[PDB]
Design a protein around this nucleic acid. Sequence first.
RNA 1: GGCCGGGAACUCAAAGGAGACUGCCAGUGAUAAACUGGAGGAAGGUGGGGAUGACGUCAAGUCAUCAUGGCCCUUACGACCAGGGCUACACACGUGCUACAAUGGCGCAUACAAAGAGAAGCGACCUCGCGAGAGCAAGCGGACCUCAUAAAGUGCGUCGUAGUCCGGAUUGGAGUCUGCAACUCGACUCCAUGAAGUCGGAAUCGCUAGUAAUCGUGGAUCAGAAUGCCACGGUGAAUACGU
RNA 2: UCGGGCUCAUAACCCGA
RNA 3: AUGUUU
Lengths: 79, 96, 150, 114, 98, 127
Amino acid sequence: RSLKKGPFIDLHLLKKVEKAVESGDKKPLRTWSRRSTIFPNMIGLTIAVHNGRQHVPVFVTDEMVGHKLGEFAPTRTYR
Amino acid sequence: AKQSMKAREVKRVALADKYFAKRAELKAIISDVNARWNAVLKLQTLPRDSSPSRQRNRCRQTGRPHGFLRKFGLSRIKVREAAMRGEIPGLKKASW
Amino acid sequence: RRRVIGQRKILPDPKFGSELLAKFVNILMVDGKKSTAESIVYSALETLAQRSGKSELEAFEVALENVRPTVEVKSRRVGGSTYQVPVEVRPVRRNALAMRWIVEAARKRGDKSMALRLANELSDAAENKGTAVKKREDVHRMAEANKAFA
Amino acid sequence: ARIAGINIPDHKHAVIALTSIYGVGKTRSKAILAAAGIAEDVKISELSEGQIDTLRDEVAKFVVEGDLRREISMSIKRLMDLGCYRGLRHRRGLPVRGQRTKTNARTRKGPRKP
Amino acid sequence: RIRIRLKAFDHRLIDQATAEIVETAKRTGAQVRGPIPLPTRKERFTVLISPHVNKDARDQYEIRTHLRLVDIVEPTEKTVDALMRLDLAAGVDVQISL
Amino acid sequence: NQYYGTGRRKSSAARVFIKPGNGKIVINQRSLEQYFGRETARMVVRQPLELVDMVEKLDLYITVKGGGISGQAGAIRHGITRALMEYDESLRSELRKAGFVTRDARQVERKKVGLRKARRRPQFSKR
RNA sequence: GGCCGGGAACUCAAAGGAGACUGCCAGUGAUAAACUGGAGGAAGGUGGGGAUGACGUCAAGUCAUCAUGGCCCUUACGACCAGGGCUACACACGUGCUACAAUGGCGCAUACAAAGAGAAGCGACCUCGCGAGAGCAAGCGGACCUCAUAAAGUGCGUCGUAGUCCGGAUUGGAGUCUGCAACUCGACUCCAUGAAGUCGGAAUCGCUAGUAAUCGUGGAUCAGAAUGCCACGGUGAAUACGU
RNA sequence: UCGGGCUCAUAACCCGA
RNA sequence: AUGUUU
Ligand SMILES: [Mg+2]
Ligand SMILES: [Mg+2]
Ligand SMILES: [Mg+2]
Ligand SMILES: [Mg+2]
Ligand SMILES: [Mg+2]
Ligand SMILES: [Mg+2]
Ligand SMILES: [Mg+2]
Ligand SMILES: [Mg+2]
Ligand SMILES: [Mg+2]
Ligand SMILES: [Mg+2]
């Protein structure tokens, strides 16, 4: 999130997301970069953020921007 | 230490003597307000296992990634141990 | 333990001249800010002036006389039991005991400034009242009530 | 009338008193005072009507007391409706801003039950 | 003029050093500011001895780096190399620039 | 004549300028009270003069360098004393008697590696 | 304007020394040692602080610094990469930091130290920014410049013993930067919020003097995250019969 | 009963709930 | 009081 002027992102995904967005849709996109700022273009895309074991398919609304896939994805355990 | 690790680190060093040795700024100037695109900043996938902040020290003599001394290069054990003999010019045990 | 010492005196009164008085400024002094101690132990008498009148010099010691004890007890274990054998304190620590207990209550006044929180007790002695003067005779209680000892 | 809305803390220095206004600190307090020529100090006794009613015109320009606390109470809710860490941690009564959860935590989760 | 900042981990490379350094160019006499003592940059270095725990031990050291000024004023070309060329020194360090 | 007074103690180092006559002091482009004055009993500068007078007798204009407050002025004390020998190298036996000629040997204490402050050490409950 | 020349007087710097040794005086004391006072001296009776840790004990600690007897793994207990974790929590303990406040808080102006730091470094100056800081760019490899603008303290405005003009946790929104990269897990700033807490049970620790106590300063490690460690000075006590 | 302290450690003892 | 644990 905190990225002053020009947030950070991992090209690895950019060349996978929109790369598959143009042609309708298909199977969930296995992400991995929890340190990447959610893109307002990957809207409700069928993906999945890695949690250190598997990936959790989550979507962002018109209220999540500076956040990263990490936020909407647990990486620990308790209770 | 551990030769297997020592070497693994050696790689993290040479890479700087290459990519960071100069091309580090070849994109830097295009990173800070110097208009200014984003393409370079976007296709920024050159410095991976390479980073001017991922190189550890480890006692030069041995290889302990802790208790390092810039003025020297070894760790507390070796340094002290060596200084005792005299492999360091002007390094008598301090005592104000 | 096996050695003996004398005493650790220092620079007396800034002008009124009074070695022991320094203690009242030191004993009260905290955080090693003697620079401020002189601001309280001195300004104090400057307030008791109208309060009492006669030389603030005497004013102090005057009421101070009704605060300094003259007999205390020291725990001494014997055959399992630890008696509270009494003992008449010499002047040296006597005057001291007072100052300690004196400055203490003064800082327990719980009002506003210490300048006043100090004068109050400085005069409360003569007129009799306060926590400071309390201890004075309060100590006498334990005293003699144990005369069966010393 | 109540300086800006409910509760009229009077008989106290301008600023220090204005601080009683739920939504203004030692900064936003003095800043607006100068915009009215009001003396950041002195009791409100020496003040006058024009030294209070006008302070509202500008105080309203900013969301305070009322909607403010509601705004924040909602912020907390907005930060939960989503299965995101920050938003989730904001529910189990545990802290959500880099803090150990093994020692010293009797603030976000109140006192312990020994 | 030419300066000569000295710096060594002992007087050995200074005592009988700076001296000759002065009576070298001026085989008979010359200006030259002359030798001087100056302060002493000291870098205390402390380290833990016993391995594993026992951080309460430690052993401190200090590399005493001495220095001298000197500096020649009159660059008598007849004595210039009479000091430069005669640059022996058992491994010291004396700067020279203006 | 242009006398001299070490007056260098407790990390401080003054220069007692004992001039002929004029008991006026002007340390660091300012007078006694026009500096450290009104902060401590620094008036102890005349303390030494309290054995043979001053004013028209001699001058006590000084100027200290380095050290702490009570140190600077305090240094002058131990200095002025010895700084009066040029007026009577035999009157010195009238200053030490009141703590003067003797330099304040008391200074800070080197912090020892292992103690909170070269004397005090952390507590040990589970000891 | 130590700003010019100039002067080498002064502090200072720092290599070589001078010095303290029951050495001298008296008493005591076996007219022994030694002790107790004295003089002289900056310094007295191992001057103060360092470093230095006997033969050994706890089969005390460290195969994880490293070395090494044996033993063990050998498409692996070897090796490389990405993400996660060591930064969990329903609790408990140790060492710490900050307050609970007027010997105080905040606004003004102001008074003074010591020791260290530094070319992928310290970075002045001036511009813009509330601000972190960003831009420009000199100087110093350094008793030459930058770090460096000590803090307590001092004199005024004030506030009046209120949980406040105290205290600062917490949290929300907005930002800066160090970095591929700061959700997981970074330091700082801006505004808003303002915690518990009013001096702490049984119990328990430290400290004999420039000590305790308090107030600041620098270093190391180090891209960027010190309430820690190491070191420096400012100021600056009480008390000590006695075992 | 539990949580803390006391001891080298238990119990006991002390504190708190 | 005990410790192979009042
Ligand atoms: Mg190996
Ligand atoms: Mg690193
Ligand atoms: Mg100190
Ligand atoms: Mg010895
Ligand atoms: Mg092995
Ligand atoms: Mg850990
Ligand atoms: Mg640094
Ligand atoms: Mg640091
Ligand atoms: Mg039994
Ligand atoms: Mg049994």
